[PDB]
């Protein structure tokens, strides 16, 4: 379905630098659900600005590991039912730690900023479309997870 070659090139901006493309899309997370910031939980305690978390250890390491999910997505975009059961524990291990599944709905607009900010006009209406009807599968195999 989702046009993998749209995907994927336009993927290939942003895998190239991980780490900062991710913080972009957490920091529009963040001004969408400021709720958020304080689901980090280190080995006690949180993050007194969106920005200092984004200097925490576990906070960059979640960033990545993030990206490597949408890039999983990415890598399976011609058949994404592989990735069924994967997404749907991770769906569960985040409802143990509180996040709500709605918050995935915002993860993807803040994908689509994210993509927006580093490819513009490159960044077409059929690509757009292409990254919502992917992340849109990725969440919806991920709600298997809240049972
Ligand atoms: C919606 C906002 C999100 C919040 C508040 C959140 C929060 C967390 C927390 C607290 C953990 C446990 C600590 C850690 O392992 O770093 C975690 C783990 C993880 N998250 Fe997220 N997360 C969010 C979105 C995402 C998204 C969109 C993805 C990718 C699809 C993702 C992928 C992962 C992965 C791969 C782990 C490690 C799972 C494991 O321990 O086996 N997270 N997340």
Redesign the pocket.
Known sequence: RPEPELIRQSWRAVSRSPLEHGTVLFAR?FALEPD?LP???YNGRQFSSPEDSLSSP?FL??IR??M???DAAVTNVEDLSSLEEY?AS?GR??RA?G?KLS??S??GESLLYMLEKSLGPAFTPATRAAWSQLYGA?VQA?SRGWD
């Open positions: 997370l958020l689901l980090f939980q576990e390491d979640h590991k993030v490597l999910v949408i997404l991770l291990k985040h730690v996040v918050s995935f915002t993860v990725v991920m």
